[PDB]
């Protein structure tokens, strides 16, 4: 209730890897920052962050730990869903959906905006999605950079959401030649791509998936709608991404293929709004998002600091004055 | 040694270790050469790298174990020289306090070392340096907030750091150690802001159990301080890159976004490249360089 009338220096939409880094930096610059996080984001479904020094942690540990740091240094935190943003010319107003049912819709104010809401991987749609979630993020992966190492020389299914996504096989084959391409029967494959799959020895299965097969979160097969199946040691879902960043529509941000175009310090085309991580154009890795938070937080602090009056040691000046 | 590595990494701190984990997880053959006791080793608390505050010692030890676990090679040595034959890099290494290794790509990840004030007994400096006597303002300004702070400036130009430190604390004393004259304009500006200027040589840092609480000068007088910031510049010892005619700006190596330098197939990470000196930046640099390299190799 005070949070609402308080003018923040910065509001961060999204409290994942990029937003939490930005929040710790801004708090340690002694700036007023509010983080708004809806919960259950992409990094949360990451079982193992394999490649972020110095320690392998779960995505849950990453988020809880970053949140604890941000709060310890003075950031404010709001469990809510960002709905809309307006730049009044003087400030950003951010409308937030609060509570899941019978919701309030508070509006917070800040001088700067950081968009750190990331993306969500499209998944195959089975009647019982728990069958997918049983394996997704374990040995059924969504990111090749993230898990190609674990796929090395293993029997791999590539689930492609479009004909263009089949091209992922010709990068996956860096790690494993034992690739089967699954379309789920969702789209036609032209003969040209057929010939290329045939040249490389990658079978093409166009049947809908009935079920992922396995035990204790280890997939070992896939059953199709006709009751035939294949044995696999691993898989990669390449079906695109959803961003649900409509809250940015009033800002007329320059985009490229869904990603927000930024400068090196993550500045967007709209003054005083920054874009971090999986939402900006670039590699989608935790390391990248965390570093984006560093650059944005530092850019904002430099702007505010260079516009501020110098803090003088007034005691010596006043005492000499009085004498 | 007889194996042609895909890449040799000079320096096994934050950025070099990040690159090594990525490269090994690209199933590339990679060698890290690390001399030990670098800048990050002396960091007592990494405050601002989510999700966990760790010592610099823990950062390096953990990163090294990860790189080895995914298949990187590691050598405790000092990189001396590099030759680009046109086909490969030859990297000569001083081992024990002089083998030559070969690779297709070079990552320069050797960072820098903060200049420290030179007292007769440096152990007195090391007692406090990296604790509440800081070397990086972005890293530790938060902890200095509104505390009595000494700024040890290695040159007149470094005195300008006071006018950024003052964001965190206005209670600034500026120490020159008597190493240079200070011009009237800078004198006026310090006095206008109320920041004492002390031009005496330092005898000793004062404190207990790694907590500095004062500074004693050569004439036997002292000041009380709760914290301090050293701003005396940096040393790189990057002569091993001398033959590659890399483009530089003030000692920092200039790179593209993906850390490519002016010389093909050599990258530069972290504190050694032009940019912010933070762990987060170095680690992401490692990600970008390793991925650019994998992409070149994969397309070849
Ligand atoms: C590898 C991977 C593994 C996954 N595993 C699982 C799993 O195991 N179990 C599971 O459930 N999902 C899992 N998912 C997530 C799944 O794909 C969907 O993204 C997810 O189920 C969306 O849930 P949702 O309906 O709440 O959508 P959301 O986008 O989260 O929510 C939809 C609506 O709910 C409201 N809302 C959301 N949050 C708030 C909030 N804090 N406050 C107020 N209102 C809010 C809003 O109106 C919003 O538009 C996984 C995803 C991936 C990539
Ligand atoms: C299974 C899996 C394994 C992975 N493994 C690795 C790995 O090993 N190494 C690596 O680098 N990367 C890995 N990744 C990718 C990694 O998670 C992302 O690259 C990273 O999380 C990017 O951070 P972000 O901040 O940009 O996005 P996120 O971390 O996802 O955070 C964005 C935040 O925005 C929140 N949010 C979204 N919309 C709203 C809204 N309207 N209102 C409020 N909040 C909102 C979300 O809930 C989320 O918390 C993995 C990803 C997955 C699914
Ligand atoms: C905040 C901070 C705190 C610090 N605290 C301490 C402290 O507590 N104790 C301390 O000693 N220093 C401390 N230092 C470091 C100090 O300032 C010097 O930089 C450091 O001590 C130099 O050690 P060195 O003589 O090995 O020089 P180095 O540069 O490390 O080595 C000099 C020479 O030794 C050879 N050599 C070095 N390493 C190898 C190797 N693995 N194999 C073969 N040959 C090698 C080479 O010919 C090289 O040129 C601290 C520094 C900072 C910034
Ligand atoms: C006291 C202190 C506290 C700090 N706190 C923070 C913080 O809180 N947050 C933050 O972001 N940053 C902090 N920093 C800065 C941080 O340490 C650097 O930004 C970071 O380490 C940069 O990584 P790097 O890989 O480039 O360099 P480094 O970590 O320094 O690694 C370079 C490596 O190269 C080795 N090496 C150098 N030369 C050679 C050679 N010829 N041959 C072989 N090996 C060589 C070195 O021994 C070293 O290990 C702190 C720094 C200090 C001194």
Coordinates of N, CA and C in Angstrom, one line a residue, chain A residues 87-247:
Chain A
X87 N 4.4 4.5 -20.3 CA 5.4 5.6 -20.1 C 4.6 6.9 -20.2
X88 N 4.4 7.6 -19.1 CA 3.7 8.8 -19.1 C 4.4 10.0 -19.7
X89 N 5.7 9.8 -19.9 CA 6.6 10.9 -20.2 C 7.4 11.3 -19.0
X90 N 6.9 11.1 -17.8 CA 7.6 11.4 -16.6 C 8.0 10.2 -15.8
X91 N 7.2 9.1 -16.0 CA 7.5 7.9 -15.2 C 6.8 6.7 -16.0
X92 N 7.2 5.5 -15.6 CA 6.5 4.3 -16.0 C 5.5 3.9 -14.9
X93 N 4.3 3.6 -15.4 CA 3.3 3.0 -14.5 C 3.1 1.5 -14.9
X94 N 3.1 0.7 -13.9 CA 3.1 -0.8 -14.2 C 1.9 -1.4 -13.5
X95 N 1.0 -1.9 -14.2 CA -0.2 -2.6 -13.7 C 0.1 -4.0 -13.5
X96 N -0.3 -4.6 -12.3 CA 0.0 -5.9 -11.9 C -1.2 -6.6 -11.5
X97 N -1.4 -7.9 -11.9 CA -2.5 -8.7 -11.4 C -2.0 -9.4 -10.2
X98 N -2.7 -9.2 -9.1 CA -2.3 -9.7 -7.7 C -3.4 -10.6 -7.2
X99 N -2.9 -11.8 -6.7 CA -3.8 -13.0 -6.4 C -4.3 -13.6 -7.7
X100 N -4.5 -14.9 -7.7 CA -4.9 -15.6 -8.9 C -6.4 -15.5 -9.2
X101 N -7.2 -15.6 -8.1 CA -8.6 -15.3 -8.3 C -9.0 -14.1 -7.5
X102 N -10.1 -13.5 -7.9 CA -10.6 -12.2 -7.3 C -9.4 -11.2 -7.1
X103 N -8.9 -10.8 -8.2 CA -7.6 -10.1 -8.2 C -7.7 -8.6 -8.0
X104 N -6.7 -8.1 -7.3 CA -6.5 -6.6 -7.3 C -5.6 -6.3 -8.4
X105 N -5.6 -5.0 -8.8 CA -4.8 -4.6 -10.0 C -4.0 -3.3 -9.6
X106 N -3.1 -3.4 -8.7 CA -2.3 -2.2 -8.3 C -1.4 -1.7 -9.5
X107 N -1.1 -0.5 -9.4 CA -0.2 0.2 -10.4 C 1.0 0.7 -9.6
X108 N 2.2 0.3 -10.0 CA 3.4 0.9 -9.4 C 4.1 1.8 -10.4
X109 N 5.0 2.7 -9.8 CA 5.6 3.7 -10.5 C 7.2 3.6 -10.4
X110 N 7.9 3.8 -11.5 CA 9.3 3.9 -11.5 C 9.8 4.8 -12.6
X111 N 11.1 5.2 -12.4 CA 11.8 6.0 -13.4 C 12.4 5.2 -14.5
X112 N 12.7 3.9 -14.3 CA 13.3 3.0 -15.2 C 12.6 1.7 -15.2
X113 N 12.6 1.1 -16.4 CA 12.0 -0.3 -16.5 C 13.0 -1.3 -17.0
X114 N 13.1 -2.4 -16.4 CA 13.9 -3.6 -16.9 C 12.9 -4.7 -17.3
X115 N 12.9 -5.1 -18.5 CA 12.1 -6.2 -19.0 C 12.9 -7.5 -18.9
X116 N 12.6 -8.4 -18.0 CA 13.4 -9.6 -17.7 C 12.5 -10.8 -17.6
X117 N 11.5 -10.9 -18.4 CA 10.4 -11.9 -18.3 C 10.7 -13.1 -19.2
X118 N 11.8 -13.2 -20.0 CA 12.3 -14.4 -20.6 C 11.3 -15.0 -21.6
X119 N 11.2 -16.3 -21.6 CA 10.4 -17.1 -22.6 C 10.0 -18.4 -22.0
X120 N 9.1 -19.1 -22.6 CA 8.8 -20.5 -22.2 C 8.8 -21.4 -23.5
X121 N 9.5 -22.5 -23.3 CA 9.6 -23.5 -24.4 C 8.2 -24.1 -24.7
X122 N 7.8 -24.1 -26.0 CA 6.7 -24.9 -26.4 C 7.1 -26.4 -26.2
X123 N 6.1 -27.2 -25.7 CA 6.3 -28.6 -25.4 C 5.3 -29.4 -26.3
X124 N 5.5 -30.7 -26.5 CA 4.5 -31.5 -27.2 C 3.3 -31.7 -26.3
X125 N 2.1 -31.7 -26.9 CA 0.8 -31.6 -26.2 C 0.2 -33.0 -26.2
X126 N 0.3 -33.7 -25.1 CA -0.4 -34.9 -24.9 C -1.6 -34.8 -24.0
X127 N -2.5 -35.7 -24.1 CA -3.7 -35.7 -23.3 C -3.4 -35.6 -21.8
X128 N -2.3 -36.3 -21.3 CA -1.8 -36.2 -20.0 C -0.5 -35.5 -20.0
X129 N -0.4 -34.2 -19.7 CA 0.8 -33.5 -19.8 C 1.8 -33.9 -18.7
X130 N 1.3 -34.5 -17.6 CA 2.3 -35.0 -16.6 C 3.3 -36.0 -17.2
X131 N 2.8 -36.8 -18.2 CA 3.7 -37.7 -18.8 C 4.9 -37.0 -19.5
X132 N 4.7 -35.8 -20.0 CA 5.7 -35.0 -20.6 C 6.6 -34.4 -19.5
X133 N 6.0 -33.9 -18.4 CA 6.7 -33.2 -17.3 C 7.5 -34.2 -16.5
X134 N 7.2 -35.5 -16.6 CA 7.9 -36.5 -16.0 C 9.4 -36.5 -16.4
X135 N 9.6 -36.1 -17.7 CA 10.9 -36.3 -18.3 C 11.5 -35.0 -18.8
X136 N 10.7 -34.0 -19.1 CA 11.2 -32.7 -19.6 C 12.1 -32.1 -18.6
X137 N 13.3 -31.7 -19.1 CA 14.3 -31.1 -18.2 C 15.2 -32.2 -17.5
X138 N 14.9 -33.4 -17.6 CA 15.8 -34.5 -17.2 C 16.6 -35.0 -18.3
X139 N 16.3 -36.1 -19.0 CA 17.0 -36.5 -20.2 C 16.2 -36.2 -21.5
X140 N 15.0 -35.5 -21.4 CA 14.3 -34.9 -22.5 C 14.5 -33.4 -22.4
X141 N 15.4 -32.8 -23.2 CA 16.0 -31.5 -23.1 C 15.2 -30.6 -24.0
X142 N 15.4 -29.3 -23.7 CA 14.8 -28.2 -24.6 C 15.9 -27.3 -25.2
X143 N 17.1 -27.5 -24.8 CA 18.2 -26.5 -25.2 C 19.4 -27.3 -25.5
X144 N 19.9 -27.2 -26.7 CA 21.1 -28.0 -27.2 C 22.4 -27.5 -26.5
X145 N 22.6 -26.2 -26.5 CA 23.8 -25.7 -25.8 C 23.9 -26.3 -24.4
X146 N 22.7 -26.3 -23.7 CA 22.6 -26.6 -22.3 C 22.9 -28.1 -22.1
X147 N 22.5 -29.0 -23.0 CA 22.5 -30.4 -22.7 C 23.2 -31.3 -23.8
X148 N 23.7 -30.7 -24.8 CA 24.3 -31.5 -25.9 C 25.4 -32.5 -25.3
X149 N 26.2 -32.1 -24.4 CA 27.2 -32.9 -23.7 C 26.6 -34.2 -23.2
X150 N 25.5 -34.1 -22.5 CA 24.8 -35.3 -22.0 C 24.2 -36.2 -23.1
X151 N 24.0 -35.6 -24.3 CA 23.5 -36.4 -25.4 C 24.5 -37.1 -26.3
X152 N 25.8 -36.9 -25.9 CA 26.9 -37.3 -26.8 C 26.8 -38.8 -27.1
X153 N 26.7 -39.1 -28.4 CA 26.7 -40.5 -29.0 C 25.5 -41.3 -28.5
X154 N 24.4 -40.7 -28.0 CA 23.3 -41.4 -27.5 C 22.1 -41.4 -28.6
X155 N 21.3 -42.4 -28.4 CA 20.1 -42.6 -29.3 C 19.1 -41.4 -28.9
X156 N 19.0 -40.5 -29.9 CA 18.3 -39.2 -29.6 C 17.0 -39.1 -30.5
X157 N 15.9 -38.7 -29.9 CA 14.8 -38.2 -30.7 C 14.8 -36.7 -30.7
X158 N 14.6 -36.1 -31.9 CA 14.5 -34.7 -32.1 C 13.0 -34.5 -32.4
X159 N 12.3 -33.8 -31.5 CA 10.9 -33.5 -31.8 C 10.8 -32.1 -32.3
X160 N 10.5 -32.0 -33.6 CA 10.5 -30.7 -34.3 C 9.1 -30.2 -34.5
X161 N 8.8 -28.9 -34.2 CA 7.5 -28.4 -34.2 C 7.1 -27.8 -35.6
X162 N 8.1 -27.7 -36.5 CA 7.9 -27.2 -37.9 C 8.9 -27.8 -38.8
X163 N 8.7 -27.7 -40.1 CA 9.7 -28.3 -41.0 C 11.1 -27.5 -40.8
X164 N 11.0 -26.2 -40.6 CA 12.3 -25.5 -40.4 C 13.0 -26.0 -39.1
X165 N 12.3 -26.4 -38.1 CA 13.0 -26.9 -36.9 C 13.7 -28.2 -37.1
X166 N 13.3 -29.0 -38.1 CA 14.1 -30.2 -38.4 C 15.5 -29.9 -38.6
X167 N 15.9 -28.7 -39.1 CA 17.3 -28.3 -39.3 C 18.1 -28.4 -38.0
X168 N 17.5 -28.4 -36.9 CA 18.2 -28.6 -35.6 C 19.0 -29.9 -35.6
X169 N 18.5 -30.9 -36.4 CA 19.2 -32.2 -36.5 C 20.7 -32.0 -37.0
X170 N 20.9 -31.0 -37.9 CA 22.1 -30.8 -38.5 C 23.1 -29.9 -37.6
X171 N 22.6 -29.6 -36.4 CA 23.5 -29.1 -35.4 C 23.6 -30.2 -34.2
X172 N 22.5 -30.8 -33.9 CA 22.6 -31.9 -32.9 C 23.6 -33.0 -33.3
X173 N 23.7 -33.2 -34.6 CA 24.6 -34.3 -35.1 C 26.0 -34.0 -34.7
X174 N 26.4 -32.8 -34.3 CA 27.7 -32.5 -33.7 C 27.9 -33.5 -32.5
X175 N 26.8 -33.7 -31.7 CA 26.9 -34.5 -30.5 C 26.7 -36.0 -30.7
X176 N 25.7 -36.3 -31.5 CA 25.3 -37.7 -31.7 C 24.8 -37.9 -33.1
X177 N 25.2 -39.0 -33.8 CA 24.7 -39.3 -35.1 C 23.4 -40.2 -35.0
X178 N 23.0 -40.6 -33.8 CA 21.9 -41.5 -33.7 C 20.6 -40.7 -33.5
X179 N 20.1 -40.1 -34.6 CA 19.1 -39.1 -34.5 C 17.8 -39.6 -35.2
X180 N 16.7 -39.7 -34.6 CA 15.4 -39.9 -35.2 C 14.6 -38.6 -35.1
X181 N 14.0 -38.2 -36.2 CA 13.2 -36.9 -36.3 C 11.7 -37.2 -36.2
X182 N 11.1 -36.6 -35.2 CA 9.6 -36.7 -35.0 C 8.9 -35.4 -35.3
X183 N 7.9 -35.5 -36.2 CA 7.0 -34.4 -36.5 C 5.7 -34.4 -35.7
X184 N 5.4 -35.4 -35.0 CA 4.1 -35.6 -34.4 C 2.9 -35.6 -35.4
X185 N 3.2 -35.7 -36.7 CA 2.2 -35.7 -37.7 C 1.6 -34.3 -37.8
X186 N 2.3 -33.2 -37.5 CA 1.7 -31.9 -37.4 C 1.9 -31.1 -38.7
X187 N 2.6 -31.5 -39.6 CA 2.9 -30.7 -40.8 C 3.6 -31.5 -41.9
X188 N 3.4 -31.2 -43.1 CA 4.1 -31.9 -44.2 C 5.6 -31.7 -44.2
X189 N 6.3 -32.7 -44.7 CA 7.7 -32.6 -45.0 C 7.9 -32.7 -46.5
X190 N 8.5 -31.7 -47.1 CA 8.8 -31.8 -48.5 C 9.9 -32.8 -48.8
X191 N 9.9 -33.2 -50.1 CA 10.9 -34.2 -50.5 C 12.3 -33.7 -50.3
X192 N 12.6 -32.4 -50.5 CA 14.0 -31.9 -50.4 C 14.5 -32.2 -49.0
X193 N 13.8 -31.9 -47.9 CA 14.2 -32.2 -46.6 C 14.3 -33.7 -46.3
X194 N 13.3 -34.4 -46.9 CA 13.3 -35.9 -46.9 C 14.6 -36.5 -47.4
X195 N 15.0 -36.0 -48.6 CA 16.3 -36.5 -49.2 C 17.5 -36.2 -48.2
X196 N 17.5 -35.1 -47.6 CA 18.6 -34.7 -46.7 C 18.6 -35.6 -45.5
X197 N 17.5 -35.8 -44.9 CA 17.4 -36.8 -43.8 C 17.9 -38.2 -44.2
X198 N 17.5 -38.6 -45.4 CA 17.9 -39.9 -45.9 C 19.4 -39.9 -46.2
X199 N 19.9 -38.9 -46.7 CA 21.4 -38.8 -47.0 C 22.2 -39.0 -45.7
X200 N 21.7 -38.4 -44.6 CA 22.4 -38.5 -43.3 C 22.1 -39.7 -42.5
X201 N 21.1 -40.5 -42.9 CA 20.7 -41.7 -42.1 C 19.8 -41.4 -40.9
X202 N 19.1 -40.3 -40.9 CA 18.2 -40.0 -39.8 C 16.8 -40.4 -40.1
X203 N 16.2 -41.4 -39.5 CA 14.8 -41.8 -39.8 C 13.8 -40.7 -39.5
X204 N 12.8 -40.7 -40.3 CA 11.7 -39.7 -40.1 C 10.4 -40.4 -39.6
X205 N 9.9 -40.1 -38.4 CA 8.7 -40.6 -37.9 C 7.6 -39.5 -37.8
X206 N 6.5 -39.7 -38.6 CA 5.5 -38.7 -38.7 C 4.2 -39.1 -37.9
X207 N 4.4 -40.0 -37.0 CA 3.2 -40.4 -36.2 C 3.0 -39.6 -35.0
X208 N 1.8 -39.3 -34.5 CA 1.6 -38.6 -33.2 C 2.2 -39.5 -32.1
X209 N 2.7 -38.8 -31.1 CA 3.2 -39.5 -29.9 C 2.0 -39.8 -29.0
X210 N 1.9 -41.0 -28.5 CA 1.0 -41.4 -27.5 C 1.6 -41.2 -26.1
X211 N 2.9 -41.5 -25.9 CA 3.4 -41.6 -24.5 C 4.9 -41.6 -24.6
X212 N 5.5 -40.9 -23.6 CA 6.9 -41.1 -23.3 C 7.1 -42.3 -22.4
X213 N 8.0 -43.1 -22.6 CA 8.3 -44.3 -21.9 C 9.5 -44.2 -21.0
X214 N 9.5 -44.7 -19.8 CA 10.6 -44.6 -18.9 C 10.2 -44.9 -17.5
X215 N 11.0 -44.6 -16.6 CA 10.8 -44.8 -15.1 C 11.7 -43.8 -14.3
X216 N 11.2 -43.4 -13.2 CA 12.0 -42.5 -12.3 C 12.7 -41.4 -13.0
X217 N 11.9 -40.7 -13.9 CA 12.4 -39.5 -14.6 C 13.5 -39.8 -15.6
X218 N 13.7 -41.1 -16.0 CA 14.6 -41.4 -17.1 C 13.8 -41.9 -18.2
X219 N 13.7 -41.2 -19.3 CA 13.0 -41.6 -20.5 C 13.9 -42.7 -21.2
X220 N 13.3 -43.8 -21.6 CA 14.0 -44.8 -22.4 C 13.2 -45.2 -23.7
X221 N 12.1 -44.5 -24.0 CA 11.4 -44.8 -25.2 C 10.3 -43.8 -25.5
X222 N 9.7 -44.0 -26.6 CA 8.6 -43.2 -27.1 C 7.6 -44.1 -27.8
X223 N 6.3 -44.1 -27.4 CA 5.3 -44.9 -28.1 C 4.4 -44.0 -28.9
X224 N 4.1 -44.4 -30.2 CA 3.3 -43.6 -31.1 C 1.9 -44.0 -31.1
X225 N 1.1 -43.3 -31.8 CA -0.4 -43.5 -31.7 C -0.8 -44.8 -32.2
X226 N 0.0 -45.4 -33.1 CA -0.3 -46.8 -33.7 C 0.3 -47.9 -32.8
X227 N 0.8 -47.6 -31.7 CA 1.3 -48.7 -30.8 C 2.7 -49.1 -31.1
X228 N 3.4 -48.6 -32.2 CA 4.8 -48.8 -32.4 C 5.6 -47.9 -31.5
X229 N 6.8 -48.3 -31.3 CA 7.7 -47.5 -30.4 C 9.1 -47.5 -30.8
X230 N 9.9 -46.6 -30.2 CA 11.3 -46.6 -30.4 C 12.0 -46.5 -29.1
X231 N 13.2 -47.1 -29.0 CA 14.0 -47.0 -27.8 C 14.9 -45.7 -28.0
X232 N 15.0 -44.9 -27.0 CA 15.9 -43.7 -27.1 C 16.5 -43.5 -25.7
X233 N 17.7 -43.0 -25.7 CA 18.4 -42.6 -24.5 C 18.2 -41.1 -24.1
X234 N 17.7 -40.3 -25.1 CA 17.6 -38.9 -24.9 C 16.7 -38.3 -25.9
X235 N 16.4 -37.0 -25.7 CA 15.6 -36.3 -26.7 C 15.8 -34.8 -26.6
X236 N 15.4 -34.1 -27.7 CA 15.5 -32.7 -27.7 C 14.2 -32.1 -28.4
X237 N 13.6 -31.2 -27.6 CA 12.4 -30.6 -28.1 C 12.8 -29.3 -28.7
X238 N 12.5 -29.1 -30.0 CA 12.7 -27.9 -30.8 C 11.4 -27.5 -31.5
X239 N 10.5 -26.9 -30.7 CA 9.2 -26.5 -31.1 C 8.9 -25.0 -30.9
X240 N 10.0 -24.2 -30.7 CA 9.8 -22.7 -30.6 C 9.5 -22.3 -29.1
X241 N 9.2 -21.0 -29.0 CA 9.0 -20.4 -27.7 C 7.8 -19.5 -27.7
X242 N 7.3 -19.3 -26.5 CA 6.2 -18.3 -26.2 C 6.8 -17.3 -25.2
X243 N 6.6 -16.0 -25.5 CA 7.1 -14.9 -24.6 C 6.0 -14.2 -23.8
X244 N 4.8 -14.1 -24.2 CA 3.7 -13.4 -23.4 C 4.3 -12.1 -22.8
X245 N 4.8 -11.3 -23.7 CA 5.3 -10.0 -23.3 C 4.4 -8.9 -23.9
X246 N 3.1 -9.1 -23.9 CA 2.1 -8.1 -24.3 C 2.2 -6.9 -23.4
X247 N 2.6 -7.0 -22.1 CA 2.7 -5.9 -21.2 C 3.7 -4.8 -21.8

